[PDB]
RNA sequence: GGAGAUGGGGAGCUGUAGCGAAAGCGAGUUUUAAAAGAGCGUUUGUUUGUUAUUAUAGACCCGAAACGGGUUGAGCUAGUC
């Protein structure tokens, strides 16, 4: 793809960088993405609730 | 590594060949003198997430008369001095 550089002033570079096709995948998986987000949200739990 | 996602870590676990108590043999094996007959095999995996059931824990909640171990009581009362 056309991934292009950014300078400090906010103007764009005139030379875009080509991208190897291995990065972009023609097949997208959404269920593994959902499970990854859920396990990231989990393990953030302190779990210090206690009752007698 | 942030009380992280994760990376390293292949120790192991399931499946890949089964049969027999076993030595053993092996797409065959056990029984038997038998190769016949019969039994079992000659294929469909694994790791997670969710739900249902189940096993160990008190295991849906409330309820005994009880049992065992320790301490406190003879200012009431019973006896004795
Ligand atoms: Mg790990
Ligand atoms: Mg046969
Ligand atoms: Mg599968
Ligand atoms: Mg008295």
Swiss-Prot record:
GO-annotated biological processes: response to antibiotic; translation
One annotated Gene Ontology cellular component of this protein: ribosome
Keyword Thylakoid (UniProt): no
Keyword Cell membrane set for record: no
Keywords for this protein: Antibiotic resistance, Ribonucleoprotein, Ribosomal protein, RNA-binding, rRNA-binding
Single GO MF annotation: rRNA binding
Annotated coiled-coil segments of the chain: none
Oligomer and partners: Part of the 50S ribosomal subunit.
Family as reported in the entry's similarity comment: Belongs to the universal ribosomal protein uL4 family.
Function summary: One of the primary rRNA binding proteins, this protein initially binds near the 5'-end of the 23S rRNA. It is important during the early stages of 50S assembly. It makes multiple contacts with different domains of the 23S rRNA in the assembled 50S subunit and ribosome.
Stated name of the protein: Large ribosomal subunit protein uL4
Gene symbol of the encoding locus: rplD
